[PDB]
A paper describes a structure:
We estimated the helical parameters from two-dimensional class averages and employed real-space helical refinement to solve the structure of the MDAΦ MCP to 3.7 Å resolution. The resulting cryo-EM map reveals α-helical MCPs packed into a tubular arrangement, with an overall diameter of ~62 Å and a central pore with a ~20 Å diameter. MCPs are arranged with a pentameric (C5) rotational symmetry around the filament axis, with a rise of 14.1 Å and 42.3° rotation per subunit, establishing MDAΦ as a class I inovirus. Each MCP of MDAΦ adopts a bent architecture with significantly higher curvature than what has been seen in previous inovirus capsid structures, showing an angle of ~45° between the N- and the C-terminal segments of the MCP. The first six residues of the MCP are poorly resolved with smeared density in the cryo-EM map, suggesting flexibility of this region. Consistent with past structural data on inoviruses, the MCP of MDAΦ contains numerous hydrophobic residues in the central segment, which form an extensive hydrophobic network through tight packing with other MCP subunits around the filament axis. The helical parameters of the MDAΦ capsid (rise: 14.1 Å, right-handed rotation 42.3°) are markedly different from other C5-symmetric class I phages such as the Ff group of phages (fd phage rise 16.6 Å, fd phage rotation 36.4° to 37.5°) and IKe (rise 16.8 Å, rotation 38.5°), with a lower rise resulting in a comparably higher number of MCP proteins in any given capsid segment. The C-terminus of the MDAΦ MCP, which is exposed to the phage lumen, contains three lysine residues with side chains extending toward the phage genome. To ascertain how bundling is mediated at the molecular level, we inspected our atomic model of the MDAΦ MCP and noticed that the N-terminal residues 1–6 form a surface-exposed segment with a prominent hydrophobic phenylalanine residue (F3) in the poorly resolved, flexible N-terminus of the protein, which is followed by further hydrophobic residues 5–9 (sequence AAAI).
Numbering used by the authors:
A (entry chain 9), B (entry chain 9), C (entry chain 9), D (entry chain 9), E (entry chain 9), F (entry chain 9), ...: 1 to 51
Write the structure that this text describes.
Amino acid sequence: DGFDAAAIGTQVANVIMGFVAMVSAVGMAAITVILAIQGFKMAWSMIKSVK
Amino acid sequence: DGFDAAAIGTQVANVIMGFVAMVSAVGMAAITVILAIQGFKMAWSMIKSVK
Amino acid sequence: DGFDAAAIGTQVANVIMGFVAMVSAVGMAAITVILAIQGFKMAWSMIKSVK
Amino acid sequence: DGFDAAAIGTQVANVIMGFVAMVSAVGMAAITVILAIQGFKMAWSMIKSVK
Amino acid sequence: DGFDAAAIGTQVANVIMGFVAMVSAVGMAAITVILAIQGFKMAWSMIKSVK
Amino acid sequence: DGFDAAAIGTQVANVIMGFVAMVSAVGMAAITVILAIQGFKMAWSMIKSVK
Amino acid sequence: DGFDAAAIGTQVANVIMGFVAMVSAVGMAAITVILAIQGFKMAWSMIKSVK
Amino acid sequence: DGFDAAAIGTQVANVIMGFVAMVSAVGMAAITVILAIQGFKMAWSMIKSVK
Amino acid sequence: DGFDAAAIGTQVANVIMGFVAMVSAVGMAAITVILAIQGFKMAWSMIKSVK
Amino acid sequence: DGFDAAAIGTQVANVIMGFVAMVSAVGMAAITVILAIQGFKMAWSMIKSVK
Amino acid sequence: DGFDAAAIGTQVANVIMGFVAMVSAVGMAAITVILAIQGFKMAWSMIKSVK
Amino acid sequence: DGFDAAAIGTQVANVIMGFVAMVSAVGMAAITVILAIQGFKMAWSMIKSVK
Amino acid sequence: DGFDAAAIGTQVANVIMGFVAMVSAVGMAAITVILAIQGFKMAWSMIKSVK
Amino acid sequence: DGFDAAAIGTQVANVIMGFVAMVSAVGMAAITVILAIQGFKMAWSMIKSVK
Amino acid sequence: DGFDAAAIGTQVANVIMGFVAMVSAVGMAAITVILAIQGFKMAWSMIKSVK
């Protein structure tokens, strides 16, 4: 009857495409860790196979 | 007696096949997130197994 | 006395076996949605476990 | 006799299609919460499977 | 008739957008735990694959 | 009306930030095990590749 | 005529906003339990995936 | 009028904070099992990767 | 009122600490298998690296 | 006038605190079943993840 | 008054402790299947890692 | 009263021990695949380490 | 006075213990379906984890 | 009195054992999909571990 | 009575065997990625073992 479906259907989507920011931010604060270990793993990794 | 069953039975269905749009839209605003993490996951994933 | 029980008892049933049509129609206008999400869910689902 | 059925039948419906607004508003004040947790859930979720 | 629908419809929403605070707070008091284990999991995790 | 939301919202969080202790304790009583095996794994691990 | 509606309408509400206390109290005596199990669940949960 | 709300509201809570005991007891009689398997799982687990 | 909580709370636990037996038994009938393969795996494993 | 309220009010309660017995008994004859399946579930559960 | 509570309370329990039999039987006719797959899974599983 | 529990309890089990056949059949039509790859994997596997 | 209570009280019960038959029959015509899907679910289920 | 219980009790079951057909059909139109992905998953899966 | 079960049972299946297309398409847009990394992985992989 009214059909206020798509009008609010975009409104809702716009609240939550403007939410990637958080996932990227917590992203960055994953990698710093994953590098820290990874880069530290690769430190000894060569000098395992130094032999 | 009257049998206004199918006539309105389509009417009702037409209000709600015209509702996928919202589910697609909130769809798109799922994937952007899921890529963001996923693509960021695959970033470190190769360079876990860099070794 | 009169026993107009089964005669109208079928009459009533015939108004309402001719009512499945609506339930099928609103059926179809469920699945289009459920696919939309489901198929979109399966989109990212493989590429979660891409790794 | 009078048949003031549809005339007021619309009148009543118009009081209550003009009621979605509230359901949308309490809608918005659901999602902010559901994001808050959800986005915070996804925060640790990647870094469960950091490994 | 009166149509005090949206006026109180916002009033109700404002009681409950001012409720995220609790969900964030119990949020923080989830992560401290989830880090505690997670960070402690990652402690041994590298030195599983020390080999 | 009353709005005793944040006041108890902190109260609840304080019961459960004071819960990490247990997770750390069961933490310690994970690692002792994980070392035991890990350190015992590394015992033979060098003297696999003694050759 | 008299219109002693709102005057007692508040009176009634005040008997029953002063009732949250009980729901909070039985609240606390839910969580102690839910922690007990939850914290005990998380005890073995890490050391399932110790592997 | 009487307002015997909090007085019995504590009374009820005290019947059911004195109920954790059972949940801890059935707790202990979970872990013995979960260890039994877990410790037995870790038995073969090292000597899978003995190689 | 009655407070038959801990009395039956132990009763229930005693039915189910007397249940480890089964988990140990199905334990033994895991390892026989896991040895069978494992010991058979280690059979060829040395004589892969015989070279 | 008479006020035979609490006198019979206890009388009634005493008929029905002496009713837990049945609920415990049908309790026991739940768990035997729930163990039977549960313990049988845990039988194959380890040897799913035997791998 | 009569207090035919425990007398029938056992009667009811005895109908339904004599019901485990079915759950064990449908038990056996689970495992035969679960072995069939499991044992067949373990067939190829070694000879994945044959290498 | 009637106690038609075990009589049908076997009847049900017999419908579903006569169901392994399907699981074996879909079994066979797993392995043909798993061999195909596995045997093809082992083809190049030796002639990786031909050197 | 007459006390034709238990005499008809059994009569009524005998009409409706002779009613399980239907519930078993509609039982069988549940499982055939539930197997059909279940057995078909287990078809792909192994060959999800074929990997 | 009449006892038209089993006579219609079969009638009802026969409407709904003649319903598996649909569940098999929607079955087939599950697997085609599940293969499509699965077979496509196994495509890259070998050539992950090509190395 | 009507038995419009298989007639619509095919109708439903035909909406969803005509759905593989999407899963193949999102398929292709998995592999391009998986190659990209895989082929790039194999780039350095030989020249790890160049030695």
